[PDB]
Design a binder for this molecule. Structure first.
Ligand code: 9UN
Length: 214
């Protein structure tokens, strides 16, 4: 029998409030969740690109800087993979839920008052837009300085972090959105292409959509 250690963390209170607001309120324009993922991937890819200019060995773990979109209609997941700089364990714990974000309160107030959900990116809390469409999010990540880790949450106020025993990634971050049953349009090729074209046209890294043959 294998033994695996898990650590469970509480979300910072306002982040938990925001997650409940995002999950339990209807919003139109939920398609912007993908813009937010691609934008975060692009930022991570920038980080490794710049780091590699001085230290080409930081690319030992993979030279290609790109984003892959992987819809899976069998398990109702949409996976966004990038070969950006990746996150350490401490980064996941800190950056994905335990540390307050200065934009969370302002954003909840904006939203309450009728701001379009598209505004979320501006408030620095765009990652949480995943919960517009997903009931559960898993973030698997590998930084050159750390082992591969998995973060996961179904909201409800906690997340977990564990060493990832799944398929090794060279470097980068994979976000797996377990979509809500009414949000399966985001597994369709045409819809994904539509929303990438509408919202993610100036990503300066290649993006490839992988479509399972029907
Ligand atoms: C010290 N650490 C600091 C963090 C550095 N890594 C990254 O920035 C990073 C981000 C991602 C990264 C990613 O490649 C895709 C994503 O969809 C989300 C990511 O991380 C984020 C986590 C939180 C937030 N947020 O809430 O604002 C935004 C992005 O992968 N690597 C690595 C060095």
């Amino acid at each position: 029998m294998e033994e695996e250690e898990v650590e469970t963390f509480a979300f910072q209170a306002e982040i938990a409030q925001l997650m409940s607001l995002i999950i339990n309120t209807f919003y139109s324009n939920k398609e912007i969740f993908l813009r937010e993922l691609i934008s975060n991937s692009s930022d991570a890819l920038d980080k490794i690109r710049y780091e590699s200019l001085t230290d080409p060995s930081k690319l030992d773990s993979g030279k290609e800087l790109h984003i892959n979109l992987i819809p899976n209609k069998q398990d109702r997941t949409l996976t966004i993979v990038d070969t950006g700089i990746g996150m350490t364990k401490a980064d996941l714990i800190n950056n994905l839920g335990t540390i307050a974000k200065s934009g969370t309160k302002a954003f909840m107030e904006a939203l309450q008052a009728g701001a379009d959900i598209s505004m979320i990116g501006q408030f620095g809390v765009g990652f949480y837009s995943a919960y517009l469409v997903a009931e559960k999010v898993t973030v698997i990540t590998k930084h050159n300085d750390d082992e591969q880790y998995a973060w996961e949450s179904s909201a409800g106020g906690s997340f977990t972090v564990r060493t990832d025993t799944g398929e090794p990634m060279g470097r980068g971050t994979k976000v797996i959105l377990h979509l809500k049953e009414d949000q399966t349009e985001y597994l369709e090729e045409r819809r994904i292409k539509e929303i990438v074209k509408k919202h993610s046209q100036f990503i300066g890294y290649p993006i490839t959509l992988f479509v399972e043959k029907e």
